[PDB]
Each structure stands twice: as C-alpha cells, then as structure tokens.
Amino acid sequence: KPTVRLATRDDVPRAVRTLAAAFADYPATRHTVDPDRHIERVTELQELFLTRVGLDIGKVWVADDGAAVAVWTTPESVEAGAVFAEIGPRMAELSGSRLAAQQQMEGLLAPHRPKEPAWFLATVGVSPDHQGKGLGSAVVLPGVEAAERAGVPAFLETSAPRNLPFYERLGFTVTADVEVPEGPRTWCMTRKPGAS
Ligand SMILES: CC(C)(COP(=O)(O)OP(=O)(O)OC[C@H]1O[C@@H](n2cnc3c(N)ncnc32)[C@H](O)[C@@H]1OP(=O)(O)O)[C@@H](O)C(=O)NCCC(=O)NCCS
Ligand SMILES: COc1ccc(C[C@H](NC(C)=O)C(=O)N[C@H]2[C@@H](O)[C@H](n3cnc4c(N(C)C)ncnc43)O[C@@H]2CO)cc1
C-alpha cells in the first residue's frame, strides 16, 4: 500500500522528475509546448505548477516520497488569479512556437471550468516505473475526499482517453467532451459532493 502525505520542499526534485517522465508524451503538452527542448520545457512547466501553484497557494500530495504527485487549487487558493497572471508570461515563453495551440486550448476549455469555488486538479503524475500499482488513485483520493467534505465540486481536464476510466472509478463524470481542431480531444470531468 502506498504512503500518501502532503509534499514538502524536500520532495520537489523527485516530484518534478515524476511529473516530467509522466508527461513525456501527453497529448496536451505535445500540442501546446514547443517540440524544441520539449522535455526541458515540460519539466519547467511542471515545476512551476508544483511550486508557484501547489506548494504556495494550493495543496500537494505525494505517494512514496514523490513516485506520484497530485497538485490542487482549493477554495482557499484566493491568490490563484494573481499567481496565474504572474506565471502566465513564463508559460507563454515555454509554449514557444506552439503558443497559438496553447491559446486555442485555453479558449476552448475556460468556459467549461467551474464558475463556483472548486477543488481543481492542476497536474498529477505517476512515475512510469511505478504505474498500475494504485499510486495514482491513492495520491488523488485525499483531494477528492477534501472537496466532498467542503461540499464543493472536484474538477479536472484530461487529453488522455486512457485516464477516463481512472477518474470515473473515483466518481468523476465527463461534463465537457471538447474537440480541439487539429489538436487532442479533451475531457473536462466534475465530481459533485457524494457522486460516489
Ligand atoms: C493516469 C495516472 C495518473 C494513473 O496513475 P496509476 O497509478 O498508473 O493508476 P493506478 O495504478 O492507480 O490505476 C491504474 C488505472 O489508471 C489508468 N492508466 C492510465 N495510464 C496508465 C498507465 N500508463 N499504466 C497503468 N494504468 C494507467 C487506467 O484506467 C488503469 O486502470 P486499468 O487497470 O484499466 O489499466 C498515471 O498513469 C500517469 O501519470 N500517466 C502518465 C501521465 C498522465 O497521463 N498524467 C495525467 C494528467 S491528465
Ligand atoms: C502546466 O501544463 C500542464 C500541466 C498539466 C496538464 C494536465 C492537467 N490535467 C491533469 C488531470 O493532470 C491539466 O490539464 N492542467 C491544466 C488546467 O486543467 C489547469 N488549470 C487551469 N485552471 C486551473 C485552476 N483555477 C482556475 C483555480 N486551478 C488549478 N488548475 C487549473 O492548469 C493547467 C494548464 O491549464 C496539462 C498541462
């Protein structure tokens, strides 16, 4: 059984290596991040989300010291807007020549995002070495339990169809099935409190 707890600064190197490996060929990052130094760009994007969103204003869990990691914003993440505005320019630069694809996907998804306070899963990853052993479910469940306790929705977006069963088992339902012209099909998933 995996050991799940809140991340510390000590977990960041391993959590970043986990997130970089997990996202090495993820359809949304392939679509929206420059193919030049792609892994380095994706690695920096994941570290930005881990540190400036997760550890600073959100909630981060790790399984087995960062073999898996889940980053959330919560209803307490009131600075989310300010932080996204601060890191927006860096994320644009990391998009590089795929900026129009980054902007396209943001435009297509923003309207299907929660208009009320939510637990929003910003990024999650399991080390490819440790996949299919329950780390994914274990590192995500605490935020899902916390959303239900607060009586707000949990929300996430995925461009990997093989993820849909994983989130469905945790009680998420597809609330938007978004065709991205010349891009990856993307699902927005909501879990209302008590959905499972
Ligand atoms: C999706 C992910 C978070 C699930 O973590 P996990 O620990 O492998 O999942 P668990 O072991 O808890 O449960 C396995 C289930 O996850 C899904 N899954 C998705 N990709 C998988 C993979 N590479 N290996 C195993 N299961 C995978 C399946 O629904 C699987 O059930 P299955 O038995 O029918 O295959 C993880 O595989 C991952 O990080 N993948 C690479 C990057 C990614 O997709 N990030 C998600 C952000 S949208
Ligand atoms: C940094 O680049 C990434 C990182 C991860 C992913 C996969 C990740 N899906 C999973 C299941 O892991 C994913 O698609 N992440 C997207 C948004 O869903 C997410 N996001 C958008 N708005 C918010 C938000 N608020 C509005 C408060 N709070 C938290 N996360 C948010 O940030 C990332 C960039 O938009 C895709 C791209």
Numbering used by the authors: 5 to 200
From the paper:
The poor initial electron density around the adenine moiety of the CoA made its unambiguous placement difficult and the adenine moiety has been modelled in both orientations. In the two crystal structures obtained in this work, with either AcCoA bound, or the trapped reaction products (CoA and acetylated-puromycin) in the other, the absence of puromycin causes little change to the global structure of PAC. The entry point of the acetyl acceptor substrate puromycin is proximal to the AcCoA-binding region, and this is also where most structural differences can be observed relative to other GNAT enzymes. The most distinctive feature is the insertion of an α-helical hairpin between β-strands 3 and 4; this forms the entry point for puromycin into the active site. The electrostatic potential of the lining of the active site is polarised: it has a predominantly negative potential for the puromycin-binding site and the opposed positive potential for the AcCoA-binding site. Rather, it is likely PAC facilitates the direct acetyl group transfer through the geometric placement of the puromycin amino group to carry out a nucleophilic attack on the acetyl group of the donor. Based on our crystal structure, the general acid required to protonate the nascent CoA thiol is very likely to be Y171, which is consistent with other GNAT enzymes by its proximity to the CoA thiol. A candidate for this could be E161, but its direct engagement in puromycin binding would make it difficult to dissect which of these roles would be affected by mutation.
Puromycin and the Streptomyces alboniger-derived puromycin N-acetyltransferase (PAC) enzyme form a commonly used system for selecting stably transfected cultured cells. The crystal structure of PAC has been solved using X-ray crystallography, revealing it to be a member of the GCN5-related N-acetyltransferase (GNAT) family of acetyltransferases. PAC adopts a fold consistent with the GCN5-related N-acetyltransferase (GNAT) family, consisting of a seven-stranded β-sheet interspersed with four α-helices. PAC displays the typical structural hallmarks of this family which includes a cleft in the middle of the sheet between the parallel strands 4 and 5 that facilitates AcCoA binding.
